[PDB]
RNA sequence: GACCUGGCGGUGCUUCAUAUCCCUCUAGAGGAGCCUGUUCUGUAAUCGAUAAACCCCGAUCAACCUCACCACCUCUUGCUCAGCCUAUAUACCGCCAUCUUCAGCAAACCCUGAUGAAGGCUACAAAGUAAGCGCAAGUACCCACGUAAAGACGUUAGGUCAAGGUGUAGCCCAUGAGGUGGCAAGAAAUGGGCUACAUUUUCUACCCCAGAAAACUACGAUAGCCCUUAUGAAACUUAAGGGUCGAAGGUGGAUUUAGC
RNA sequence: AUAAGUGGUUGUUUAUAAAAAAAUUUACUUAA
């Protein structure tokens, strides 16, 4: 289309929170989870509205 | 909730307790044993308790060329088809009350004489129908283990033999 | 719109049919349940909302007795709560206005006071003398020129010609001028009401049209598009008259729609060898409509295509056929072809006449862009495909002719079962075709085994019988070939007369005496009075004494 | 008898006809309209990944079979026409902002869901 | 009779890929190489399996961490286990002499390194004996571990005695080939700033610590850490001294200017950055015996000790909560 | 047909609070400045102290939608950790997965 | 010992799938996940009413196509569009999926306010991944 | 809207387009329980006053 | 009587022991005050965990709510095609502890023991072949390292009917539902922690070249009283700040934890 | 070659079973 368009990779975040094993007890027992967020811009330039 | 029915498997994993520790060691002595039952066994999809005929789904979706339309059965129609269910549910579990007669061997309650039929057929076509099996001697012999302890195991003794001239036996 | 499976594809005309009633149906239960417990479907989460994804309401929330309230029955189209509502508001003594009052007889009207059925709860007249909707018009203090209209027209969809007119003429003694609609009703009535020759009714059509140029009634598509359709019952005395209304329309400015060339070429389209007046005229519209793109305008414009192409087949016109489709492809066209009917139709006819003819790797072409991707053939046309590939000499092709045949449904089509093994055992071929055919025609005995018909009579087509030995002995399969021996006996159906001559050859290539005397004394059975010929070919080619007054002394 | 299933039509298909047509929009992974050999899955010990067919892990993919670079080609020639043509004369960010001061930012947040 | 439950015990469906099998998989492959490169509009000739792998990563993106869970499309040969050929024709008589040791590949090979010894007294780096996983898909026989020895010893007995060519070209066939990496300190190229100056440049990283170092061909000892002389940028002195250490080594201190940045970390994180990009940068301005001694000193190494996170249930990356007996 | 009697006390201590929400902000403006006179600052006191008790906001207890459990819930899922880990762990929340590092 | 979504060992006759055969460590390692939108991602909105529907669309169509379902559900969301993708078995009349397929469709789409498509996906068996 | 969610899945399933393994299962326990004899008392008419 | 298998032996020999034995190294706990569990006492006034593998444990958390408790007052087809935090974790699913800081569990065969319970090892090899499951490999994090994660079958009827669900038994004018108020204290005894006892310290400046302090507001409370503020409808209670107040404590008995 | 005492009670193997639901009209408009 004729468009100026770079590209780079933002850092990622991975965020993660610690939950409970067992249902009860056993507090020193854990299940860790994460989330990714990965990221890529698309650096568009001079373009029109249409 | 609608969000805390679980699903039959899970139901009927968790009501027959077939695992645990009581089936361990037999530290359970309940002889009494439940059954699953599949409730789905005779589940017609689209059948319900109102009596509603959805077409192409519960009926036939054209009837005389024509695509059938939204229909529900007679209240007196609807008590017919729920009395039925009951009756088949009744005479299939009627079918599963009937105490098959086990032909007995040297006692009611012994494995000796009791007859295993023709030995299995062999790899490459080898067959056996000519042998007849009858049993000796059923044994629970016991061995120690270090992790579980007493174990079981079965020793059976078993002859074979076609009744002219060829037998053998086994453990 | 099927489901993209292999399972799910659908397999015939019947299943696209069958299909897409199944799925329609499970929407009519969805929307069933939906408009019936609208409180599980009163939750708007969208975000911008969306009004068509909420449940209906179809009874009037207002009891009241107001004019307001009798627009709800009237809008909601409940034509009882309207006529009970407006017998208690009569009585009330309440003014009604003659918008509102017009308004609920065009309902009343229009149904024949028969309330349209919705979601759950033909032969002979419809309409009856004792209705409301008569005795409303009575009550009615003030009828204007639109409670005259309005009563005609529904008239008419309910085959009440006579009062009809008997009602115009109270129309005409108001000094009422009637408006288009009415005059295009009006029009269907007195031809369709009495069975009078062209020319009675012709100058009846005449009378009318002066009162409508008398009464600056200015005509519609509507109103020559009627004019054609009842035209239709005089099907050779109209077809001039026809050409003079063509030209008329395009003089005042009226553009012909696919409806009015529908009723045109319906019309000069009757039983005839020649058909060349009818021909031109084909010819001339299509060249008139050579790329024009169409906007729907009236009702009919959708049966063009189905009509346009039968006589297009009917004449055997391929490259008139091509004009035809040719239009259908052109812009948005292709919307005008209509139902799943005229689908099939259109293309079942446009593609008879391309095997015909076309050449045949032009066939191959539109073979297989037209199916199944748009159209699911026939069992006849399966066998038009096997004719137009034997005239072209392409039997190559065969074997792939019966796969598909399974494909589509016809695996168990009797006379598409035929065609193909004739075709294949006709002539012989060099060794790759005759293996080829013989391995097609394995597949075929498995369904002739297999019949489904067999549950009602299991038919063993004597030549298909043969087709397949034939085969099977061009193959190296005499064992199986020997085992349809027992078939015919069995079923008692005694060989042909080739299979019979051919037979002698499987003997000589085996080169095994024993088969040949087994074939012979079975065949002799049978009193055949080829056999008999046979049997004195064998008895010089090689028969042993013994066995010969063996023979003798049966008979 | 019970119904069989018709053979895929990725038999039907010729090596050379325009994918394109066969995905026209993004669409589920459908193994019998695919005529790719594509396998996935871990494999078991001494085994293969699991073939297209009932395969989950293929059906968990967001495939790019509706964009294949021929399909961007053919898309973008029809989308020209829509689109108008950058101020030649704004060629550098110092032209940009000699005749157009101002600047106004904002964003647009493409999410999914109902709302 | 007694009938007992026909357990099912062939569940297990095994690995049976027939040689018919795999052509029909062969011819999979080829249509589907060519519908492939269709796709993608590239010509089906030149269509490699780089360009399989590639079209095929962009129409089925998986993230999946693993590269064997990832969808792929690849020739059968590369894909299917190599299975052995069937052993007897339809008599039933196996094709080898050695089949019934069930082993005819490893004991064959055996018999034929034993004969090539015997025969020999009739007469009279880089590479790596291919491991136990590798003879064994060349022989496509399961193998012991002491079998695998004892063969490797027949060979190593073989090339102490003299071999003729024939025999060379034999005994490579089980010799592959190990690449073997330098331990030697890639330099940094020398460049000239605008009044023709010669400058190295390089960095490091300590924790968390980032530097950027350039350092000149000539000059008085002068560092400017972040604009700031080295001095008062580091006022702790252990943080001068690891400055110090690159140029004190190889006897260079007073001759370089050096100009650093840095960014992360703490104090001495960040003077251990500096140091190795400084040590880095001034390897292009000493001899390759030098940057050898900087390298055997330990100045060139990225030092990776990096902190450990915290465990759940415990107190620190290793420190435990209190045990309580009772 | 909430998951129990607790859930359902909360699921109508929402509600009010909701109803209330405009007439408890109004009020306690009034009362959270020091401008107006205390003289009204304490009618107000009187009327925010006579509104029903389930009106009061910190009376909502932010418990698993699916189970009621009002301790070990995830605010961004409305879920305990139980009812959690249970789609985590079959690989139904979009991206969730088990952390290592 | 943990338990969590591990289909125990067994006596080696117990067919498993793919998704069965893999524990939750797998699940962005050899498998991925049932369920794509946006909610999860950092700075995004409405992971609680994306996970309530999704509990329930599971349950709807285990319940709305018994016995049928082969596998679990695949659900994906681009902006407004809902898709659920079902590898179903072949047992049932193909005119009895496409009523199911019209009605479920229908049904959600009204229920939860957007476009919602399904995606049938017929087996003849179950896809054995292993034997535990 | 745990009203909404249960009431419409429960006249989904006495439609028939719904099946409840759960309520399948639960009614079976009920109907064996009646048989034993061990069936809900009628409110108020109970065997206390 | 004689065996088989396991266990155990203050059983032999030989190797070992990794912050996994001893001698070694560093910082702590056991004494003080405080904080927070538990027990015990009390109260009309919850339940669970309770050698290792309970004891800042369910709780990533209780002023009301939460709540299940107690008192009083109400309701009866009842938010629900009811309900029950009633009994039974020794009927269970679900999710886990524990060995495991393991390497073993093994179907199917074949052989040995006179065809007993059982057993199956030698590489210059003598009866074992074994598919699967663990370990391993792979993958995550910053690497081939390390840390995670993983870690079978079983053992401890180990934990959890009070996450939810549920078999069995029970309650149904009440063992259910709701409102108002209230308890949730300390003679103490013990677990874990925080802060100290100071000179490698205290206070300011600076965040590393300073000035002061240093046994009568030296060091030392995050504790008590007072005030204010924050949140809340509600704070004598919760938190933050300020002031006031300068307590015990002067490196801690038997014993005991952690770390490569 | 030091010395190392004790542990209420109680406890295990009685026998096999299975379903299907499903298929008449394969192409118009039209008229009396
Ligand atoms: C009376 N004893 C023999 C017993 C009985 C039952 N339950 C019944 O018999 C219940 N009977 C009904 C069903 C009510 C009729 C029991 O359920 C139990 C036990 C024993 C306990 C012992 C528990 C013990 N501690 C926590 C007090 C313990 O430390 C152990 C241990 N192994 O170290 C336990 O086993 C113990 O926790 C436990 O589980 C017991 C029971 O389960
Ligand atoms: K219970
Ligand atoms: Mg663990
Ligand atoms: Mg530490
Ligand atoms: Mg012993
Ligand atoms: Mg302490
Ligand atoms: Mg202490
Ligand atoms: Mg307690
Ligand atoms: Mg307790
Ligand atoms: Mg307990
Ligand atoms: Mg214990
Ligand atoms: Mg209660
Ligand atoms: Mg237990
Ligand atoms: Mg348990
Ligand atoms: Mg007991
Ligand atoms: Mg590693
Ligand atoms: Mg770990
Ligand atoms: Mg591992
Ligand atoms: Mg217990
Ligand atoms: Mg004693
Ligand atoms: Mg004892």
Not at chain 3, 6 to 23: D, G, V
Not at chain 5, 215 to 237: A, C, E, W
Request: charged residues 30%; contains cysteine; aromatic residues 10%.
């Amino acid at each position: 289309l004729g468009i100026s368009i770079k590209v780079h990779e933002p850092p990622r975040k991975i965020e993660r929170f610690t939950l409970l094993q067992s249902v009860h007890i056993y507090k020193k027992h854990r299940v860790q989870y994460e989330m990714r967020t990965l990221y890529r811009c698309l650096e568009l330039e001079h373009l029109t509205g249409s | 909730s609608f969000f805390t029915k679980l699903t039959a498997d899970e139901l009927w994993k968790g009501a027959l307790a077939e695992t645990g520790a009581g089936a361990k060691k037999g530290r359970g002595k309940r002889t009494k044993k439940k059954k699953r039952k599949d409730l789905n066994r005779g589940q017609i999809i689209g059948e319900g308790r109102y009596g509603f005929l959805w077409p192409g789904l519960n009926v036939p979706l054209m009837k005389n060329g024509a695509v059938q339309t939204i229909a529900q059965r007679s209240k007196e129609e609807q008590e017919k088809v729920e009395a039925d269910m009951i009756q088949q549910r009744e005479e299939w579990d009627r079918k599963k009350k009937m105490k098959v007669k086990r032909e007995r061997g040297w006692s009611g309650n012994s494995w000796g004489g009791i007859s295993l039929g023709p030995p299995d057929p062999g790899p490459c076509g080898e067959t056996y129908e000519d042998f007849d099996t009858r049993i000796l001697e059923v044994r629970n012999v016991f061995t120690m283990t270090a992790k579980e302890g007493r174990k079981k195991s079965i020793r059976v003794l078993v002859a074979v033999g076609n009744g002219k001239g060829a037998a053998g036996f086994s453990i | 719109v099927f489901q993209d499976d292999p399972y799910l594809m659908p397999a015939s005309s019947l299943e696209s049919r069958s299909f897409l009633l199944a799925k329609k149906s499970g929407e009519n239960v969805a929307k069933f349940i939906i408009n019936s417990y609208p409180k599980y479907f009163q939750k708007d989460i969208a975000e911008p909302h969306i009004p068509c994804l909420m449940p209906e309401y179809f009874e009037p929330q207002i009891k009241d007795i107001s004019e307001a309230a009798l627009k709800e029955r009237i809008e909601l189209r409940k034509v009882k709560a309207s006529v009970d509502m407006f017998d208690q508001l009569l009585q009330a003594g309440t003014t009604v206005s003659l918008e509102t009052t017009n308004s609920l007889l065009d309902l009343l009207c229009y149904y024949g006071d028969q309330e349209p059925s919705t979601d759950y709860h033909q032969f002979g007249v419809t309409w009856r003398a004792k209705n409301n909707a008569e005795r409303i018009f009575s009550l009615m203090p003030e009828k204007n020129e639109h409670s005259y209209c309005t009563m005609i027209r529904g008239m008419v969809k309910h085959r009440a010609y006579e009062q009809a007119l008997n009602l115009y003429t109270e129309l005409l003694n108001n000094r009422l001028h009637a408006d288009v609609y009415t005059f295009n009703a009006l029009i269907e009535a007195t031809v369709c009401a009495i069975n009078e020759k062209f020319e009675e009714k012709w100058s009846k059509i005449l009378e009318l049209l002066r009162h409508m140029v008398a009464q600056k009634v200015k005509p519609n598509l509507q109103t020559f598009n009627t004019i054609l359709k009842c035209l239709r019952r005089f099907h050779v005395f109209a077809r001039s008259p026809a050409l003079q209304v063509l030209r008329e329309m395009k003089a005042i400015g009226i553009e012909p729609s696919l409806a009015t060339y529908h009723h045109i070429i319906r019309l000069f389209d009757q039983p005839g060898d020649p058909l060349k007046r009818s021909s031109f005229i084909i010819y001339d519209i299509m060249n008139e409509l050579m790329g024009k793109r169409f906007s729907p305008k009236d009702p009919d414009d959708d049966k063009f295509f189905q009509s346009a192409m039968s006589i297009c087949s009917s004449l055997r016109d391929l490259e008139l056929a091509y004009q035809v489709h040719g239009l259908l492809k052109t812009g948005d066209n292709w919307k005008f072809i209509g139902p799943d009917q005229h689908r099939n139709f259109y293309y079942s006819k446009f593609f008879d006449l391309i095997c015909l003819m076309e050449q045949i790797d032009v066939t191959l072409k539109w073979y297989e862009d037209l199916i199944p991707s748009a159209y699911f053939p026939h069992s006849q046309t399966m066998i038009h495909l096997l004719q137009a590939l034997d005239v072209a000499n392409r039997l190559e092709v065969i074997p792939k002719i019966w796969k598909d045949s399974k494909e589509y449904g016809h695996t168990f089509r009797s006379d598409l079962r035929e065609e193909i093994l004739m075709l294949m055992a006709r002539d012989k071929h060099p060794p790759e075709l005759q293996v080829a055919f013989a391995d097609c025609a394995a597949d075929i005995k498995s369904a002739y085994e297999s019949q489904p018909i067999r549950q009602t009579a299991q038919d063993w087509p004597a030549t298909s019988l043969n087709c397949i030995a034939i085969l099977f002995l061009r193959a190296g399969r005499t064992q199986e070939a020997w085992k349809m021996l027992g078939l015919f006996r069995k079923h008692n159906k005694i060989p042909r007369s080739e299979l019979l001559n051919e037979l002698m050859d499987s003997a000589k290539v085996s080169n095994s005496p024993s088969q040949a005397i087994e074939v012979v004394e079975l065949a002799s059975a049978f009193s055949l009075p080829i056999c008999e010929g046979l049997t004195q070919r064998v008895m010089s080619d090689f028969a042993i004494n013994q066995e010969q007054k063996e023979a003798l002394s049966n008979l | 008898p019970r119904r069989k299933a018709l053979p895929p039509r990725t038999e039907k298909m010729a090596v050379d006809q325009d994918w394109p047509s066969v995905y026209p929009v993004a669409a589920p992974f459908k193994p019998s309209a695919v005529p790719l050999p594509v396998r996935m899955g871990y494999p078991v010990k001494k085994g293969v990944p699991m073939a297209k067919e009932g395969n989950l892990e293929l059906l968990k993919i967001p495939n790019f079979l509706h964009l294949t670079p021929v399909a961007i080609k053919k898309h973008c020639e029809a989308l020209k026409d829509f689109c108008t043509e950058w101020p030649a004369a704004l060629d550098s960010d110092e032209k940009c902002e000699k005749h157009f001061p101002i600047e106004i930012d904002s964003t647009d947040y493409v999410s999914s869901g109902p709302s | 009779a007694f009938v007992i439950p026909k357990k099912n015990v062939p569940t297990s469906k095994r690995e049976t890929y027939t040689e018919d099998f795999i052509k029909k998989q062969i011819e999979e492959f080829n249509i589907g190489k060519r519908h492939l490169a269709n796709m993608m509009g590239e010509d089906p000739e030149t269509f490699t399996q780089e360009d399989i792998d590639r079209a095929i990563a962009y129409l089925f993106p998986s993230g999946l961490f693993e590269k064997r869970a990832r969808p792929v499309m690849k020739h059968p040969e590369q894909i299917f286990p190599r299975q052995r050929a069937i052993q007897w024709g339809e008599d039933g008589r196996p094709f080898h002499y050695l089949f019934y040791t069930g082993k005819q590949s490893y004991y064959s090979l055996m018999h034929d390194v034993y004969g090539m010894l015997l025969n020999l007294e009739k007469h009279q780096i880089g590479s790596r004996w291919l491991i136990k996983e590798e003879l064994e898909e060349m022989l496509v026989e399961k193998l012991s571990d002491l079998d695998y020895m004892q063969f490797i010893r027949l060979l190593e007995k073989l090339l102490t005695s003299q071999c003729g060519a024939a025999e060379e070209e034999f005994v490579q066939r089980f010799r592959r080939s190990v690449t073997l990496e330098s331990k030697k300190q890639l330099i940094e190229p020398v460049q000239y700033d605008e009044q023709g100056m010669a400058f190295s440049k390089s960095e490091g990283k300590r924790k968390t610590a980032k530097a950027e170092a350039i350092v000149y061909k000539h000059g008085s000892g002068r560092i400017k850490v972040n604009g700031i002389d080295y001095q008062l940028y580091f006022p702790i002195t252990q943080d001068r001294e690891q400055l110090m250490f690159p140029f004190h080594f190889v006897d260079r201190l007073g001759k370089h200017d050096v100009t650093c940045t840095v960014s992360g970390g703490g104090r001495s994180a960040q003077a251990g950055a500096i140091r190795l990009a400084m040590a880095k940068a001034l390897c292009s301005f000493v001899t390759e015996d030098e940057v050898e001694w900087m390298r055997q000193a330990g100045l060139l190494t990225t030092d990776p000790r990096v902190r450990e996170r915290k465990k759940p249930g415990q107190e620190g990356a290793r420190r435990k909560f209190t045990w309580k007996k009772r | 047909h909430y998951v129990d009697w607790r859930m359902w006390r909360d699921v109508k201590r929402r509600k009010m609070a909701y109803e209330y929400a405009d007439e408890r902000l109004r009020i306690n403006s009034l009362r959270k400045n020091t401008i107006l006179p205390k003289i009204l600052q304490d009618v107000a006191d009187e009327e925010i102290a006579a509104l029903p008790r389930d009106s009061c906001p910190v009376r909502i207890r932010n418990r698993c939608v699916m189970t009621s459990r009002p301790r070990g819930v995830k605010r961004r899922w409305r879920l305990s950790r139980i009812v959690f880990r249970h789609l985590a762990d079959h690989g139904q929340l979009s991206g969730i997965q088990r952390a290592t590092w | 010992k943990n338990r969590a979504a591990r289909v125990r060992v067994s006596k080696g006759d117990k067919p498993v799938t793919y998704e069965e055969a893999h524990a939750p460590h797998y699940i962005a390692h050899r498998k991925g996940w049932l369920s794509l939108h946006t909610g999860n991602l950092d700075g995004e909105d409405h992971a609680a009413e994306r996970t309530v529907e999704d509990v329930f669309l599971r349950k709807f169509m285990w319940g709305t196509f018994p016995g049928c379902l082969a596998d679990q559900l695949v659900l994906k969301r681009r902006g407004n569009q809902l898709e659920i993708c079902a590898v179903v078995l072949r047992q049932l009349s193909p005119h009895k999926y496409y009523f199911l397929v019209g009605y479920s469709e229908t049904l959600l789409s009204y229920f939860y306010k957007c476009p919602v498509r399904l995606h049938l996906q017929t087996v003849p068996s179950k896809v054995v991944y292993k034997y535990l | 809207n745990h009203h909404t969610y249960a009431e419409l899945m429960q006249t989904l399933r006495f439609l028939g387009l719904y099946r409840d393994e759960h309520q399948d299962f639960m009614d079976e326990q009920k109907r064996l329980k009646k048989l034993r004899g061990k069936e809900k008392p009628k409110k108020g008419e109970g065997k206390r006053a």
